Design a protein around this ligand. Structure first.
Ligand SMILES: Nc1ncnc2c1ncn2[C@@H]1O[C@H](COP(=O)(O)OP(=O)(O)OP(O)(O)=S)[C@@H](O)[C@H]1O
Ligand SMILES: Nc1ncnc2c1ncn2[C@@H]1O[C@H](COP(=O)(O)OP(=O)(O)OP(O)(O)=S)[C@@H](O)[C@H]1O
Lengths: 380, 49, 359
């Protein structure tokens, strides 16, 4: 009341007090500058075919209009007007002014990440060797090109990941994407499936355009089974456009002037229908895999999901881990959350051991008819 | 005098266009015939309603 | 007595909210702008306050901007305002409106509430505690720091009330409802599945807290169509896109997802893992007690002639659902208004029973 009425009086006193400046002072924040931008130029952009000899004498296809032979203006450099270069050309006299970056196909612009999702390395504990190897590949050359040069090696420019579903692949990728420091570029595997023939090829072209422009970047591939796994050939002509997309992914990855400062991470759920051209190292070098957390892994993942929740700390966690022999971290998360939900049945602020036992026999033994991994452990 | 008003035919032409929907500040949005769209003005005589 | 001073100062703040030369500056902005404001299309943005646009024919221009409106409302694939004489960026255009949104978003209070559901009482509290109590009462979860359960699968034999449960959640709500039947993910063009999926969840994540209800999704695998490209090797990619869109990257957000099936054993279990979907709920054919509630409520608004017994109808079919009950309770009325009557006799139910069941 007193805070409310006094804050209303003070804030509206400042408001109605500046109202004197509002009704007394009589956009223009740029108006004179914008009218000095009226002697500027419309500057239509184009595409260059070739140059001529002894003179500039440049040749240009605009985009649709025609093709013209032009000359350069005086405020240009006679060097960086090379072929296949989107340059801004005068509308009246048809003269080249500024070279620019090329066409990027803007539906490919929206897969750079532009943010950082907050996932810390602490969330994948119990997978120490995998974290170690993937750290060794991804983090270390971008932050320390010291051991890799003074000993004279090349780090493995590609790492694939696999395992059963829900094992931490996506989560490890996001953990890298927190501490990446590079131009991390997401690619869903279904992004390369378009209506028209050979269009996903051009998407891969533009991906590696962006990759070669910006040095020291990361590209993440995700569920590469849609991108293409096998070249089953019959008298039907079936899955073929996907196959050409996969081949164009092969060649512009690694071979005949290799890739540069780019690292590719792939992640699949079923690494078994893959053409062994991808299985050739030099493209996909380290086969890092995620098995199930055996015994102590689930203790540690209980420590992960349990460290910031309202429980009774007098209980143990090892007995909880001993009842989950073939289980993923997702099922662990469901156990923790569902034990909380059983605590919401009553009105308590701390869990009990019986709540977690209800959670175990609620998740595992009940929904074990679905359970997602009796037919992916065999990697069908 | 109506026949001597023939300097009216000799002036210019006029377009036919399709309205998507209007907006604030006494304007509309018109997609003329083959081309794109244009935020244009009304005359004095027509209702925005 | 705080009402007087609080109201006076709050109305002063509201009138100073409307109190935000100046008309000369408006006229100067109108002088900079042309009157035939032409519409363009961005392709890229260059940081030096002039960028590339794209006209409706394909011509493209490096044009400056009349920078008073927020240019950072604009991305690739946006609609701008341009001039005829200098082609310069006049400013931002508000977004085009909205066939996918208007089709896929249920706007209205969409039917009856929990007073119509027939005796479940346990499934109801589960979907309640998974959607209603989280969203409408987001205070318990702060106390324990436990994230709400994400996905809910409704399943069971046909006629049990999945559609009713979805409609009842959509009744008592505070969030934007998004309904897509799962059979609309099979297109006769190649590469149209992921476009639908990304647009659907783009709508969901951009608009509001929401409930995306996706019904009869099991028919996406067990129904091949001649009006299609290469079937299973596109359907699988569509399911994979739905998978990655559902539990992929970049901080998923405030989007609830409820799906409903008839059969569940023909599903790819990669959707059915937790982390995506946490609650799986069975809908069985109930009992011979909550049937009394179903016949009662579906006869609660009619001039029932009291010479009938509902226990004559409960015993009739051993595995009848609420579908059969609605069918009989409406077909008896159709027999009633066939002969210009109001009240419904026993032989009406007999003919309705012999019409619904055994034909
Ligand atoms: N080893 C783990 N330790 C801790 N949390 C884990 C672990 N594995 C999985 N989780 C949790 O469960 C979630 C599911 O893992 P994800 O990697 O997202 O699954 P996934 O990689 O999408 O598997 P798919 O379906 O084959 S793509 C993670 O985001 C974590 O929240
Ligand atoms: N438990 C119930 N109590 C009352 N009416 C019910 C019940 N179950 C179904 N109904 C009736 O059935 C109609 C709703 O149909 P649903 O049972 O939801 O159909 P459905 O089998 O779920 O269709 P699907 O989802 O494609 S299998 C309502 O109009 C009700 O009259």
């Amino acid at each position: 009341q007193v805070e409310d009425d006094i804050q209303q009086l003070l804030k509206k006193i400042n408001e109605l007090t500046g109202i004197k400046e509002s009704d007394t002072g009589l956009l223009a924040a740029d108006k004179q500058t914008l009218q000095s931008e009226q002697p500027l130029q419309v500057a239509r952009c184009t595409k260059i075919i070739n140059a001529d000899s002894e003179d500039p004498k440049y040749i240009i296809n605009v985009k649709q209009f025609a093709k013209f032979v032009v000359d350069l203006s005086d405020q240009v450099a006679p060097t960086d007007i090379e072929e296949g270069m989107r340059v801004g050309v005068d509308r009246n006299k048809y003269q080249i002014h500024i070279p620019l970056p090329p066409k990027i196909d803007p539906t490919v612009t929206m897969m750079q990440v532009e943010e950082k999702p907050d996932v810390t390395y602490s969330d994948v504990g119990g997978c120490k060797e995998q974290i170690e190897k993937l750290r060794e590949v991804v983090e270390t050359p971008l932050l320390h090109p010291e051991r890799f040069v003074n000993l004279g090696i090349e780090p493995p420019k590609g790492v694939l990941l696999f395992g059963p579903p829900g094992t931490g692949k996506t989560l490890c990728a996001r953990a890298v994407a927190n501490r990446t420091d590079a131009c991390f570029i997401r690619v869903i595997g279904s992004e390369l499936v378009q209506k028209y023939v050979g269009e996903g090829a051009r998407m891969v072209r533009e991906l590696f355009e962006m990759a070669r422009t910006k040095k020291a970047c990361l590209i993440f591939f995700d569920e590469i089974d849609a991108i293409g796994g096998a070249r089953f050939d019959d008298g039907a002509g079936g899955d073929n456009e996907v196959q050409r997309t996969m081949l164009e992914l092969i060649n512009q990855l690694d071979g005949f002037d290799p890739r540069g400062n780019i690292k590719v991470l792939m992640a699949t759920n079923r690494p078994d229908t893959l053409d062994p051209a991808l299985m050739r190292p030099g493209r996909l070098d380290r086969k890092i895999e995620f098995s199930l957390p055996d015994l102590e892994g689930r203790t540690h993942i209980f420590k992960i999901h349990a460290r910031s929740m309202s429980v009774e700390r007098d209980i143990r966690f090892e007995l909880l881990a001993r009842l989950c022999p073939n289980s993923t971290g997702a099922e662990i998360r469901s156990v923790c959350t569902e034990a909380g939900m059983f605590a919401i049945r009553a009105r308590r602020k701390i869990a009990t051991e019986k709540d977690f036992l209800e959670a175990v026999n609620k998740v595992i033994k009940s929904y074990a008819k679905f359970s997602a991994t009796p037919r992916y452990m065999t990697y069908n | 005098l109506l026949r001597e008003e023939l300097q009216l035919l000799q002036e210019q032409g006029s377009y036919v266009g399709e309205v998507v929907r209007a907006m604030d500040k006494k304007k509309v949005l018109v997609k003329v015939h083959p081309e794109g769209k244009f935020v244009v003005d009304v005359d004095k005589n027509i209702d925005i309603n | 007595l705080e009402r007087i001073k609080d109201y006076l100062l709050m109305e002063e703040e509201f009138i100073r909210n409307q109190e935000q030369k100046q008309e000369e500056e408006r006229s100067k902005v109108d002088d900079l702008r042309g009157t035939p404001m032409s519409v363009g299309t961005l392709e890229e943005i260059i940081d030096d306050n002039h960028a590339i646009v794209s006209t409706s024919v394909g011509s493209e221009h490096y044009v400056s901007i009349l920078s008073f409106v927020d240019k950072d409302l604009l991305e690739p694939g946006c609609s701008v305002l341009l001039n005829h004489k200098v082609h310069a960026v006049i400013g931002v255009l508000m977004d085009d409106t909205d066939p996918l949104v208007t089709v896929m978003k249920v706007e209205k209070a969409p039917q009856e509430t929990y007073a119509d559901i027939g005796g479940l009482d346990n499934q109801i509290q589960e979907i309640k505690e998974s959607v209603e109590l989280p969203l409408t009462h987001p205070e318990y979860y702060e106390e324990m720091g436990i994230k709400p359960p994400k996905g809910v699968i409704l399943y069971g034999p046909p006629g049990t009330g999945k559609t009713l449960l979805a409609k009842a959640v959509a009744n008592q709500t505070s969030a934007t409802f998004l309904r897509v039947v799962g059979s609309e993910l099979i297109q006769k063009y190649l590469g149209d599945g992921p476009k639908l999926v990304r647009e659907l969840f783009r709508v969901a994540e951009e608009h509001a807290p929401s409930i995306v209800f996706i019904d009869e999704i099991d028919a996406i695998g067990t129904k091949r169509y001649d009006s299609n490209s290469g079937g299973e090797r596109e359907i699988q990619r569509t399911m994979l896109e739905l998978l990655n869109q559902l539990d992929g990257f970049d901080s998923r957000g405030d989007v609830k997802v409820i799906m409903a099936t008839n059969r569940i054993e023909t599903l790819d279990p990669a959707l059915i893992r937790p982390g995506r979907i946490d609650r799986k709920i069975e809908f069985p054919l109930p009992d011979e007690k909550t049937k009394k509630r179903i016949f009662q409520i579906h006869t609660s608004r009619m001039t029932l002639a009291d010479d009938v017994t509902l226990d004559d109808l409960i015993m009739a079919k051993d595995d009848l659902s609420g579908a059969d009950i609605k069918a009989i309770c409406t077909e008896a009325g159709l027999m009633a208004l066939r002969e210009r009557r109001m009240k419904v006799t026993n032989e009406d139910f007999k003919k309705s029973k012999e019409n619904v069941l055994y034909k």
